[PDB]
Amino acid sequence: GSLDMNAKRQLYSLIGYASLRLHYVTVKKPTAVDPNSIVECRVGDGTVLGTGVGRNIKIAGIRAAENALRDKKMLDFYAKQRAAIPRSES
RNA sequence: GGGAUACCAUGUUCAGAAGAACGUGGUAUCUC
């Protein structure tokens, strides 16, 4: 895999629905002696789908995405939620 | 000689299912 296109898609194409809040948070302020940074993949609900770290951070970005789609159970979990979700959170 | 993160500003591209991310250059610290 290792394909962003695929990732980003899996996100706002396989799960990312209306009123999801899905969002990534950058953590580990890069350094000029180890730029490497990490990414947190979670949702406003306080749920982290996964994570991703890299030396040129990007790997971290794309890695984070692939991480979100790296949870078949989590993914499918939202699939059902999507069907349920009564025009709101609960 | 090469290489990288980031601030300030703006835009393109990735893909080609779907929709998102990265880049362009100005300055700088560090590093090989």
CATH architecture: 2-Layer Sandwich
Shape: elongated
Q: How are the strands of the biggest sheet laid out side by side?
A: 1-2-3
Extended strand count:
3
**Rounded Rg:** 14 Å
Q: What distance lies between the first and last C-alpha atoms, to the nearest angstrom? A: 34 Å
Total helical elements = 3
Beta-strand residue fraction: 15-25%
The CATH class designation is Alpha Beta
SSE order, one letter for each helix or strand: HEEEHH
Q: In which range does the helix fraction lie?
A: 40-55%
- As for the CATH topology, it is Double Stranded RNA Binding Domain
Class by helix and strand content? Answer: alpha+beta
* Count of the domains: 1
Biggest sheet descriptor: 3 strands, antiparallel
3D structure, described in words:
With 90 residues, this protein is an alpha+beta fold. The chain has a single domain, classed as 2-Layer Sandwich (Double Stranded RNA Binding Domain), CATH 3.30.160.20. Helices cover 40% and strands 22% of the residues. It is built from 3 helices and 3 strands, in the order αβββαα. The protein has a 3-stranded antiparallel beta sheet, covered by helices on one side. Strand 2 (37-43) and strand 3 (47-54) form a beta hairpin. Helix 1 (4-15) packs parallel to helix 2. The termini are far apart. The relative contact order is 0.19. It binds one RNA strand of 32 nucleotides through residues 3-14, 16, 29-37, 55-58, 61-62, 65. This is Ribonuclease 3.
